[PDB]
Amino acid sequence: QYDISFADVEKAHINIRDSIHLTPVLTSSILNQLTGRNLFFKCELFQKTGSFKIRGALNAVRSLVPDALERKPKAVVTHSSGNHGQALTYAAKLEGIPAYIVVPQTAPDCKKLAIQAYGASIVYCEPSDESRENVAKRVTEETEGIMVHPNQEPAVIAGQGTIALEVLNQVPLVDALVVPVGGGGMLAGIAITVKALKPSVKVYAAEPSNADDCYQSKLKGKLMPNLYPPETIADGVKSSIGLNTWPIIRDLVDDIFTVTEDEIKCATQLVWERMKLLIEPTAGVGVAAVLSQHFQTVSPEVKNICIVLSGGNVDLTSSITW
Amino acid sequence: AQYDISFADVEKAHINIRDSIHLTPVLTSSILNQLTGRNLFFKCELFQKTGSFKIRGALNAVRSLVPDALERKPKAVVTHSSGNHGQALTYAAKLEGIPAYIVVPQTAPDCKKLAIQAYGASIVYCEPSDESRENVAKRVTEETEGIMVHPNQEPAVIAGQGTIALEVLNQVPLVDALVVPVGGGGMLAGIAITVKALKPSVKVYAAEPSNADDCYQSKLKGKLMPNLYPPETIADGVKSSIGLNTWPIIRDLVDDIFTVTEDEIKCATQLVWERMKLLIEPTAGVGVAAVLSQHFQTVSPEVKNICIVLSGGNVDLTSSITW
Ligand SMILES: [Ca+2]
Ligand SMILES: [Ca+2]
Ligand SMILES: [Mg+2]
Ligand code: NA
Ligand code: NA
Ligand code: NA
């Protein structure tokens, strides 16, 4: 029915388990008191590469084929340079194949150095989408590579779903998962998984109000991407949801809570200060959601809530004051 | 052997406090394993109530010590510390439904007053002198039928800190060594008593800033040699010298002492923030720095499984830049 099934999530877990961390679920008395709930924190910030994206990236490297005539990917290529590019480069290195990140000439020096530092090769393009698409396609063809989208690639979605397999095992009495949403690869994989295994468990999305395409899409009942690149401290969720993740989110996600920039900032600081966990602000989105006014509408029966702390890739130098 | 505490005291402490403290997790780091050549285990006391291990000793003290009054239960706790000890004692007081008072000189920063009240201690003012601090504390202690608790020499505190090792030995059955940052040595001594009682083959190693190397010097000379002057160190939680109660334990039951430079501390702290995503305070960086240090490299390969106590996470976020 959807672009992935529970069976695909299971193949993904089999595919990646030898190379990822089964990250712990931690608790906090303080956050319990603030929210009125029994919170559990799935610590993807301690995952290899500093985010959960290694799950989808590794699955993609281990399951996609470059061509009808070649079963083994000979390189990986992506346009995404942040947590996905880092995760995809690590997956490529594990598999002994090169990684290419397609990068506009106009990217900051910092960005270019960062990519080099995580061991990928840069391929330069023009800022135009016509240029990016041409270059990424050329690279993929020349290298016999796989292009691995950060959130719409089914093997990626299936990989991200493995988080929910762990959560359900680590937290048998869980009532709800709270998941930050950008392109919805994580949200959709988790929704498929939870609704296949234990549909009484709620799946809730958390999103910056400044980038609220997932909320608007669920509100309208059709895919409504951001018209303009969003401004948010939550840099990992600036993608819009897309054609593969939207149908899953429409049908299998119970609710979407949006949060202000101030709420994201305050929740991130709270996690740093009270839990001593170096989350990136994007991972504060889910915490903000559970602290927000609208989350009080959630039935008191929904007591045990697992929030995914999705990443820890923060540049601390410039992060304190943001 | 015989010392100010025995393992029996640690067992009592565990029963006294276990219902109110976190059994903190032990985490691991692939990168740190590779950098040291060891299997490291990180006992995460930065996740403990109040943000440090000190609630163990503080709660044990609040539940064990008696005031100088009619009724056997303390009606208050009075403190000098606005740091980890003070915050831990304040929380232990809240659990027991008794006021915590902190004696503060008239001229302490308005910032630090706000911070004191943030954790719920009641400020009693004194004049800025060691005479006035002491005498106000005594008065308040007596008038409130309260108790005072030394941060590292009090036997109830030392016994409480030992509870760390009880957990570690359960959590890491094959542990070969514990690495523990040392200031006053309450934690190091409580750990040593526990380890040597339960599994004496496990090594107990102390870690300390080279800028405050009283523990190293003491062990070298075979006598208690406190720091000549108050040390300057980024490791603000280990500025105290070892005292008369912890020294004998440390002399007899601690296997070795590793010192680390300020740069080694700062670097180890940053490494933990960046690579483990754990907001340790620099004092907790001391033990990591120790296992990374050249001198530690020379330690026998049979000592494979090493548990480092990440002792606290109470760090000023804004001041994190430039440490
Ligand atoms: Ca969005
Ligand atoms: Ca010292
Ligand atoms: Mg239930
Ligand atoms: Na192809
Ligand atoms: Na499974
Ligand atoms: Na599709």
Numbering used by the authors:
A (entry chain AAA): 4 to 325
B (entry chain CCC): 3 to 325
Provide text from the study.
Human serine racemase (hSR) catalyses racemisation of L-serine to D-serine, the latter of which is a co-agonist of the NMDA subtype of glutamate receptors that are important in synaptic plasticity, learning and memory. In mammals, D-serine is synthesised by a pyridoxal-5′-phosphate (PLP)-containing enzyme serine racemase (SR). The first mammalian structures of SR, published in 201031, revealed a dimeric structure with each subunit consisting of a small domain (residues 78–153) and a large domain (residues 4–67 and 156–316). The roles of Ser 84 and Lys 56 as the Si and Re-face acid/bases in the catalytic cycle of hSR are generally accepted.
In contrast, in ‘open’ hSR structures, Tyr121 sits in the core of the small domain with its hydroxyl contacting the key catalytic residue Ser84. Analysis of 600 fragment-soaked hSR crystals revealed 44 interesting binding events, of which twelve had displaced Tyr 121 from the core of the small domain in at least one of the four subunits in the asymmetric unit. One of these is a 1.53 Å crystal structure of hSR bound to compound 1-x0495. The difference between the conformations of the A- and C-subunits can be seen when there is no compound bound to either subunit. Interestingly, of the four subunits in the asymmetric unit, subunit C is locked in a slightly different open conformation. and compound 13-x0430, was only observed to bind to the C subunit.
